[PDB]
Amino acid sequence: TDPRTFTGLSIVEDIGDVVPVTDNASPALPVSLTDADGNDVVVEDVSRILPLDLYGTYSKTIAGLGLVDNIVGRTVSSTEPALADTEVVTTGGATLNAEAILNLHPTLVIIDHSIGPREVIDQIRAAGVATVIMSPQRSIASIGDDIRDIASVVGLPEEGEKLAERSVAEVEEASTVVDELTPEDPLKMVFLYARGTGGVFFILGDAYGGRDLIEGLGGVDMAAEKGIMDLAPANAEALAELNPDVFVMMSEGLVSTGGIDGLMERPGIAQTTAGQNQRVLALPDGQSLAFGAQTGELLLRASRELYVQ
Numbered sequence: 001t002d003p004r005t006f007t008g009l010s011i012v013e014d015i016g017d018v019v020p021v022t023d024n025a026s027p028a029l030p031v032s033l034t035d036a037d038g039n040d041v042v043v044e045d046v047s048r049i050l051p052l053d054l055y056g057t058y059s060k061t062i063a064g065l066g067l068v069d070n071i072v073g074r075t076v077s078s079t080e081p082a083l084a085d086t087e088v089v090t091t092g093g094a095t096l097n098a099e100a101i102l103n104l105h106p107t108l109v110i111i112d113h114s115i116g117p118r119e120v121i122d123q124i125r126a127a128g129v130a131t132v133i134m135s136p137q138r139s140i141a142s143i144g145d146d147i148r149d150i151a152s153v154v155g156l157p158e159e160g161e162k163l164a165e166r167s168v169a170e171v172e173e174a175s176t177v178v179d180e181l182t183p184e185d186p187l188k189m190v191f192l193y194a195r196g197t198g199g200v201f202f203i204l205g206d207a208y209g210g211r212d213l214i215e216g217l218g219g220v221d222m223a224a225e226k227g228i229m230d231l232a233p234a235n236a237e238a239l240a241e242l243n244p245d246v247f248v249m250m251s252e253g254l255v256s257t258g259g260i261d262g263l264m265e266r267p268g269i270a271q272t273t274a275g276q277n278q279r280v281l282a283l284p285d286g287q288s289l290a291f292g293a294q295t296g297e298l299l300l301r302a303s304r305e306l307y308v309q
């Protein structure tokens, strides 16, 4: 079949919890490290972990390593089922709440600058909480190295190596399937971020890592073609210039703008090729840009929806 003739929404269902590599993780502590901001940190107690980021990666990797039961709080992006009853420590999108964090009496915060404010991260450290700043590479090629970095922090290097190798094998196997499914002329895609029916409506660029998802699905990321390094408002002019064949979206984000019907009301959407085919690939919000352990499964499920009728 010709995937340019497909129409309508394709939605990937929740992939669920990460399968841990062990049921008896025994952290080798203490650990001393210099983090991505240059802070020297001693990690001596991992009993109460806050693994916080915009993308939902760290909570999933921590579970993959065998420490899911140690997670005591989360951001909204960590939507995996195991954490559904775990306290949320952000407000709005991803704004850190110092009071909520400190009231959970964490022993370790793993975080990066995808969320903030920076000043709240500094307050938590000053209050006596061991805080480790990561700067993950967030590419498909670096899935294993990003896992190994997290594993080092919690004193689980062997589990890290197992999880890294398993995840890299899964993502290379998925890529074999993707390559067989892709059309000769790649589909043009964008990652369209939506939250609500108002102005939170953006084409995501380099900083958010959607290019590696789109290219992992065999597509061309029109944001990369046009040099978008952070994000651009998805206004009519931008949409006409990018003119994708498929909008890649987050499932709950799409619901929040009124589903396909609401999306089609937004200026410029209906005039693109994707809009004329009402062609949206919706991915679970908390997996879509998480990469990490589940990347291979995500690529497999998404490529089936893109290329198999």
Ligand code: HEM
Pocket: 054, 055, 056, 076, 077, 079, 092, 093, 094, 193, 195, 200, 204, 208, 252, 285, 286, 289
């Ligand atoms: C790129 C990765 C991002 C991910 C994975 C992500 C994920 C999420 C998730 C899971 C929620 C909670 C949705 C709900 O429970 O209703 C949320 C809410 C939100 N996001 Fe994002 N988001 C991202 C980027 C952004 C960006 C770039 C902005 C703004 C520039 C933004 C603004 C918001 C806002 C305002 C909310 C609050 C919506 C509400 O009132 O419930 N997000 N996001």
